[PDB]
Ligand binder design. Sequence first.
Ligand SMILES: Nc1ncnc2c1ncn2[C@@H]1O[C@H](COP(=O)(O)OP(=O)(O)OP(O)(O)=S)[C@@H](O)[C@H]1O
Ligand SMILES: Nc1ncnc2c1ncn2[C@@H]1O[C@H](COP(=O)(O)OP(=O)(O)OP(O)(O)=S)[C@@H](O)[C@H]1O
Ligand SMILES: Nc1ncnc2c1ncn2[C@@H]1O[C@H](COP(=O)(O)OP(=O)(O)OP(O)(O)=S)[C@@H](O)[C@H]1O
Ligand SMILES: Nc1ncnc2c1ncn2[C@@H]1O[C@H](COP(=O)(O)OP(=O)(O)OP(O)(O)=S)[C@@H](O)[C@H]1O
Lengths: 686, 258, 160, 67
Amino acid sequence: LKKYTIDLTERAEQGKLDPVIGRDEEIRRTIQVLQRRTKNNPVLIGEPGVGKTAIVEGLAQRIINGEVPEGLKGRRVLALDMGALVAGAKYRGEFEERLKGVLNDLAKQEGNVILFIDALHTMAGNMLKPALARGELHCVGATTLDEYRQYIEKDAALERRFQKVFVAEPSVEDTIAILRGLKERYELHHHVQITDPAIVAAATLSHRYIADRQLPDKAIDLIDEAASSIRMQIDSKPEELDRLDRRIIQLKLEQQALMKESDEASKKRLDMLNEELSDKERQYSELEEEWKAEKASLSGTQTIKAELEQAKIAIEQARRVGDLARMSELQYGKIPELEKQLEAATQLEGKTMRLLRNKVTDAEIAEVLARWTGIPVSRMMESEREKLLRMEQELHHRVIGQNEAVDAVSNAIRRSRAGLADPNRPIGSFLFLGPTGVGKTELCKALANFMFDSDEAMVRIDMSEFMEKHSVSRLVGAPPGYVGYEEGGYLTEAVRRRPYSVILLDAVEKAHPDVFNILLQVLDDGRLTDGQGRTVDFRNTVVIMTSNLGVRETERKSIGLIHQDNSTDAMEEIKKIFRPEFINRIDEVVVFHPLGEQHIASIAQIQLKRLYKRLEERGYEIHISDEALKLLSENGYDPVYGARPLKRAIQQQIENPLAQQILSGELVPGKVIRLEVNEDRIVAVQ
Amino acid sequence: SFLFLGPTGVGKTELCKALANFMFDSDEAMVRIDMSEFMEKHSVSRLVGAPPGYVGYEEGGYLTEAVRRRPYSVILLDAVEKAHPDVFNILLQVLDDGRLTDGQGRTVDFRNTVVIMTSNLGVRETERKSIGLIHQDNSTDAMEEIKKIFRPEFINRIDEVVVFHPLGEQHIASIAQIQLKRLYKRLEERGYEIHISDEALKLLSENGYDPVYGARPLKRAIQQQIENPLAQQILSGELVPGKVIRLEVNEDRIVAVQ
Amino acid sequence: LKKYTIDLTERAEQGKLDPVIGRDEEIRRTIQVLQRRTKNNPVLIGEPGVGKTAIVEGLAQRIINGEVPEGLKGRRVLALDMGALVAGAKYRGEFEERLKGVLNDLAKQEGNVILFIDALHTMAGNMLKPALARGELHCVGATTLDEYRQYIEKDAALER
Amino acid sequence: SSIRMQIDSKPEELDRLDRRIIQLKLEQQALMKESDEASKKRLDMLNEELSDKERQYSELEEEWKAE
Ligand SMILES: Nc1ncnc2c1ncn2[C@@H]1O[C@H](COP(=O)(O)OP(=O)(O)OP(O)(O)=S)[C@@H](O)[C@H]1O
Ligand SMILES: Nc1ncnc2c1ncn2[C@@H]1O[C@H](COP(=O)(O)OP(=O)(O)OP(O)(O)=S)[C@@H](O)[C@H]1O
Ligand SMILES: Nc1ncnc2c1ncn2[C@@H]1O[C@H](COP(=O)(O)OP(=O)(O)OP(O)(O)=S)[C@@H](O)[C@H]1O
Ligand SMILES: Nc1ncnc2c1ncn2[C@@H]1O[C@H](COP(=O)(O)OP(=O)(O)OP(O)(O)=S)[C@@H](O)[C@H]1O
C-alpha cells in the first residue's frame, strides 16, 4: 500500500476532484453491491466518458461528505493501478510475490478498505478468486462492453464474482445540470463568463451533429475548447492593433534601418516620415494604453473570481467543521456584498469599453461545431448576402437556361442555411428529368464549384454500372467472411470522411430496386448502416439524380406528351419500388427544356473563355469577327441533340487550322492573333 | 410479432417511433434493420456474425450483440420483400421459441422482445388494386410472394396481420397542425411566431391531398409553398425578431407577413 | 526524456529544420486545442504528401520566434523515440519498467513541456490512458487516415 | 443487503422532514440575522413553524429510535 495504491478519498479531501451531479439509483445500486455478503464487486459497463470513473469520484465525495449510509462511514477507497506492479520482475516469482504481499496487506487491512480497479480489462487470475470468494477482495472495476467480452466474458469467477450495472448516455437536461455543475470549475481555469444559451445550445447541437462521442463528453470539450479560444483571443492583441502594429513596426524598423547613414540629418529628406513615425509611436501608445486598461479590468476580474472561489472552499471547509454564525455572517455577510458591488463594477467595466469580450457566447459554439461540419451561422454577419443573393447569377454564369431548376436548387440551399429543414431528414433530394444536351453535369459542377470551389467534392457515382445483386456490395461494403468486409464500401467511407458534401448519381434507373430501397432509407430518414456494422448519418448532405428513365420518352414528349405521363413511366420504376413518402418527400422531378439561339451564342462565348484562358497561358490572344460567331451559331444547333455538337463544330472548324499553323511556327507570340472569316470558313491571321 | 400491410400513407415506422418514445422515451433504442440490404447469401454473415476461423469472427453480428446487451427491447424490421429466405428462416427460429444461436457459439434469448415488420406487399398492389381487394384476398396475393417461403409455421407464428387504410382529410388537417409545431420550435429558436388564417391552412389542406399518394404531399407542399419565401425574407435581414408573422394570403400563393 | 527523447526546438535553434509557408488557421487551431485543460491532445490526419510533421516543426519555429501567444513561451517540445524504449523486449515484462520511469520524468518536469508523438497508430497504451485522461500528459499526435482506420476508430479510451 | 440498507438509512418522513427543517434552519439563519429588527424580526410565523416541525421531527425521530 506504500507503493502501489492511490487514495481517492484524500484527493477528494483536497478538493482536487470535480463534483458529479446525479445518477442516484446507480449509487444506491452500487452500494447494494458493496455491502452484500458475496458478489461484493460491481462492474460498470457503458461507453467511455459517460462518467464511470467520475461515478467512482462523486461516490468518494459523498463518502468524505459523510452522506454515505452507515457502516461505510470511515471506510476508505483506494485505486490500484498497474505499472507500479509491473516493475523489475525479470525472473519468475517476483511479481507474484509482490501481489501476494499486498494481498496480505489487504488481509491485515481487515476488510476496512474498499479497493478500486480502473480498466478491469487490463489485468494474475489465480491470486484473486479465493479472496474474491471470501468477499475480502472488495473492489470496483470499470470498462466497456467489447473489452469486457473479448477480455473474457466467460472465466468462472471472473464473471461469477461480478455484477453488471449499465450506465447509459443520459438526457439533454441531465447533462445541462452537469454543465451547471462544472461551469464554475471552468471559469476558474478559464477566467471568463458562462452564458446560459451557450450551454443549452451546446448540449442541443452537440446532440444533433456529433455522431460518435457521447453526452456529456462532447459538450464538455466544447466548453473547454471555446473557453480556450477566448483566452487565446484575449491573450493576444486585436488584429487592428496587430496590422496597424505591423505598419508601426514597419516604419520604426524603416527609420531604425535608416539611422545608420553618413550624415543622418542630410539624408533625412524623409522628415515627414520621422514625424509620422512619432505619430506611430503615439498611436501605438494609445492602442497599448487601452490594451493595459482592458488587462487591468479583466485581470482584476480574474483575481476576484479566484479569490471568490477561495471564499467558497473556505466556507465548505467551514461546513466540515460547523461554526454557523461565522459562516452566516460570511456567506450571508461580507462575501455577497462584495459580490454584488463587484458585479456592478465589472459590468461597468464591460460597458466602459468595447474591445473587451467576456461572454462565451453561443455563437462561438456555433462557430466551433460549424468548423467541424461546415454549417455556420456566422456568415450572416459576413458578406454571404452577396453570393447568396447572386446564387442564381453565379450559377447563371456557367449555366444558361432553366431558371426553374436553379431557383429550386437555390431555394433549397437557402432554407438549409435558414435552419428550416427537418433535422431528421437529408437536405436535398433531387431528381432532374430533362432531355439530353442540357447541362445537368454543368449544374452539378457549378454547385460543387460554388460551395467547395472545385469539382473534387462532387462524388460522382455511375448507376449504369449497376444491374445485379453485387452492386450494393460494391458501394456499401462486404459482409464478414470476406476481404471486402475488412475493406468496406465506397459510399459509407466516403461520407464518413467529410460529412456534409455533394453526392452525385448518374442514370439512376439501371440498377436493382435494392439500390432504390436503401435510397429510401437515406431519403426518408437519412441513415444507413454499413455491412461493417455501424449507422452512418446522411442527414445533411444533398443527393442529386440526373438520369434517363424519362429521357427516351422526354425526347418525344416535348411538346405534346403530358408531364403526368412521363411522370408515370418515369414513375414505372419508381412506384415499382418507391412509395408516396419518396416522391412526395423528395424535392422535385425537375424538367428541363431545349435551347434557343442566344443560349448557343452565350455558351459559345463562355466556352471560348476557357480557350482564351489556355492560349492566354500560352501567350496568345485572339480577336474574332462577329460573323464567325454567327457561322458557329449556325453550325452548333440541332434540336435532337442540344448544346453538345456545337463543341464539335468549334474544334473541327477552328482548332485544326489553328493547330497546323501553331505548329507551323507562322504564328508568333506577343502579336495578337486575329480570326477572320476571310473564306467560307474561319481563317487565322496575325 | 406484428406485420404491417395494406397501403401506406400512414407512418408505420412513425408508429414504431411512437412506441420508442413511449416506453424507452426516445427513438434511439429502437434498433432498426433493413431487409433490402439483406437479399444476398452473405447477408447472414452481416447480421448474425461469422463462422469460425475467418474474417469477422470474434466480432459477431450486431443483432445478437444488441439483444444480448439489453435483453428486452423493440426490434424494427423493414420492407421485408427484399430479404433472403434464410433470413426468413433464421427469423423462423426467432418467432418460434424466441432464441437464436450465433456463429460464435451460444444462444440469445428473445422471449420478452417485440419484433415489428413494416412491409409493402399490400402497397405493392393494394394502391393499384383499390377495388375489390379484401383482407383475405390481400392475404392471397400477399401469399403469392409470401406462400412459398412463409408457411403456416411462419404465417401462423406471426401474431397479427395488421392491414392499413387510406386517410381522411381531417386527418391530414391534424397532421398539418402537427407539422406546424416543430416549425414553431424553429421560431422559438429565433424568437418568432406564425399566425395563419383558417383559409390558408385550408389551402394547404386542398393542396396536400392526393388519393393514391395519401396525405404525404403535406410537408413538402408546406415548406415548398411557404418556407421558400420565408427563407428569402429571413435571409434578407428583412424580418425582425421579437415580432409576429401572420400567414396572410396576398393572392392564392401564401405569403408570410410581419 | 534525456534518456530517450530528442529536442526538436534545439534543432530549429540550430537551423536544421525547414520553414513552412502559411496554414495559420491550422496551427492556430492546434494552439486552440492545446489550451484545453484536459484531453489536450490534437491529432493531424492526412496523407504523407500533405506534410504535417513539417507543420509541427514550423510550429516549433513560431514558438522559438515568440510569435506563439503567451504562456507557451516557457515551454519546449520533444519528440518520442519508439525504438530505444521498445528494443529491450526480450522477456515478458521489461518495457513498462522503462516506460513508467519515463512517465515519472514527465511528472518531474511538471507541465512545462509539450510532447510530440509520431505514428500514433503504432503507440503499451493502457498506461497512456490515465495521463491523457486527466490532461496531465500534454502531448501532440499525428498520423495517417486509414492508419487511423486500422487503428480502431471505436477503440474506447483512444478516441476520447 | 438492500432491505438492510433501507433499515440502516434514515427514513423518508425523517429525511423529508429533515429537508424541511434544514430549509427552515437556513431560512431561520437568514431571518434571525436582521437588517431592521423591527421589520425582519416579524419572523414569529417561521419560529412557530420551527417549534411545530421540531415536534413532528422529534416525535418521528424518537419512534425511529425505539424501533
Ligand atoms: N455526470 C457527470 N458529471 C460530471 N462529470 C462527468 C459526468 N459524466 C462524465 N463526466 C466527465 O467525463 C469524464 C470521463 O468519464 P469517466 O469518469 O472517465 O468514465 P468513463 O465513461 O469510464 O470514461 P473513460 O474513463 O474514458 S472509459 C470524467 O472524468 C468527467 O470529467
Ligand atoms: N446550359 C448549359 N450551359 C453550359 N454548358 C452547357 C449547357 N448545356 C449543355 N452544356 C454543355 O453540354 C455538356 C454536357 O452537358 P452535361 O453538363 O453533361 O449535362 P447533360 O446535357 O444532361 O448531359 P449528361 O451530363 O450526360 S445527363 C456540358 O459539359 C457543357 O459543355
Ligand atoms: N398518418 C400519419 N400520421 C403521422 N405521421 C405520418 C403519417 N403518415 C406519414 N407520417 C410521417 O411520414 C414520415 C415517415 O413515415 P413512416 O413511418 O416511414 O411511414 P412508413 O410506412 O414507415 O414508411 P416506410 O419507412 O417507407 S415502410 C414521418 O415524418 C411521419 O411522421
Ligand atoms: N507546406 C509545406 N511546407 C514545407 N514543407 C512541406 C510542406 N508540405 C509538405 N512539405 C514537405 O513534405 C514532406 C513530407 O511530409 P512530412 O512533413 O514528412 O510529414 P508527412 O505528411 O507525415 O509525410 P511523412 O513524414 O513521410 S509520413 C516533408 O519533406 C515536408 O518538408
